[PDB]
Amino acid sequence: VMGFKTRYGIGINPFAESAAQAPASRIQSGMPSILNSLGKNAYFRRVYVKGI
Amino acid sequence: ASARGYVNIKTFEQKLDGNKKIEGKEVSVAFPLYSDVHKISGAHYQTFPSEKAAYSTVYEENQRTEWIAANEDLWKVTG
Amino acid sequence: ASARGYVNIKTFEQKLDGNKKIEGKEVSVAFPLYSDVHKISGAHYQTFPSEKAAYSTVYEENQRTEWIAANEDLWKVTG
Amino acid sequence: ASARGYVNIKTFEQKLDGNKKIEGKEVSVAFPLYSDVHKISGAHYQTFPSEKAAYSTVYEENQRTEWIAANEDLWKVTG
Amino acid sequence: AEIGGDHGYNATNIAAGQTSGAVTQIGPAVMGMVRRAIPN
Amino acid sequence: RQTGRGEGNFIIASRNVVNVLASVDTGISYAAQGLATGFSTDTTKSVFAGVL
């Protein structure tokens, strides 16, 4: 037998949502989900294209 | 219980005008709730930490806005 | 809720003796409670973390000893 | 008694198929008898020595073949 | 009144660095580890 | 026995106890006592009386 194992973790820039004046709960998870990153990260803007 | 303790807040009754007063109030706020949001400053109050709520009115962590409204209400002036 | 998430534990039915068994059980234990006491080893089981209890039987922080007894009960052999 | 001690054998009941099981059994075998014959290998069992038979069923040395048959029987599958 | 606040005198709150006031803490440093002694 | 680390190394005691300790021969010897000399029995000069 054989195989591989790995561990990493990812996360949110603390100011990424940009709209908030302040975060809730004072200590929050930085792991992306529905409530903290979806459609909200100020560092990235996605535009669809058509007609090409 | 919050199991993180409580913040015990007492508001001391004060006179604003003839027949206008801000009543005293006693509330306990789950530690993480108080920590999350509060507008108590300049209010004529006193506060201490405890392992269990010191007061009959308690805002458990799962309140957020019931608490915010309750904290804004510390400024309400009545008869 | 536990306000810190849960450890979700599932056991599988075990054929221990003639017409005797350890029934599979599904429990959810407040994370810090699980952390304090967990005898689940050698239980023919499976676990995972969650935000909300994944199961109908949940042991919250204030249960302490109901949980310890419930944990021990995971190996009870019945009819 | 065997006057040389006994080997105590516990066979753990196991399920084989729909309505098929090998029944659990507890036997004590005179040390020299056990030493002469033991078909207890791969049997789902555990053993220990003792100064006196640990179980109600004992195979004294002067039985010889009762025990040999008793060993084949530790594999018998019943309803 | 930038009140830093305090901990809840609750072991979890301390460990997590959570304050009742303005500033969140890194955590309670370390004071080392005590290992149980081996008998002779 | 209970700490698993070691035997008592210090004593905190009232003035009367120290006055007794300071006035007894603490080594292995015949019954003996006299004026206190072994430890300071004073609290004005210090709070450290001496080593028993």
Side-chain angles (χ1 to χ4, degrees), chain C:
Chain C
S2 72
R4 302 196 197 189
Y6 299 84
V7 179
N8 296 285
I9 306 100
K10 178 172 174 64
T11 65
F12 296 78
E13 184 169 311
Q14 298 173 54
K15 303 300 188 185
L16 268 289
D17 208 329
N19 299 329
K20 298 288 184 291
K21 61 181 176 177
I22 300 171
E23 293 181 355
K25 296 181 179 178
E26 294 180 349
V27 300
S28 180
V29 181
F31 186 92
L33 177 58
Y34 183 85
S35 180
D36 190 349
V37 177
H38 58 271
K39 293 182 173 184
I40 300 96
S41 68
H44 207 57
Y45 71 97
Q46 186 177 116
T47 65
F48 61 94
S50 70
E51 295 79 6
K52 301 291 184 182
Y55 301 115
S56 66
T57 298
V58 60
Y59 297 90
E60 293 295 346
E61 203 28 65
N62 65 359
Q63 296 298 300
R64 186 76 189 280
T65 61
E66 184 65 21
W67 167 239
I68 293 166
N71 190 170
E72 290 173 351
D73 194 59
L74 292 173
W75 295 265
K76 183 176 179 179
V77 180
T78 190

Side-chain angles (χ1 to χ4, degrees), chain A residues 15-42:
Chain A
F15 291 93
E17 68 276 18
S18 181
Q21 297 299 316
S25 302
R26 305 299 298 278
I27 303 172
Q28 65 178 28
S29 174
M31 295 172 279
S33 190
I34 295 298
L35 298 175
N36 61 2
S37 67
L38 179 62
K40 297 182 180 183
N41 188 328

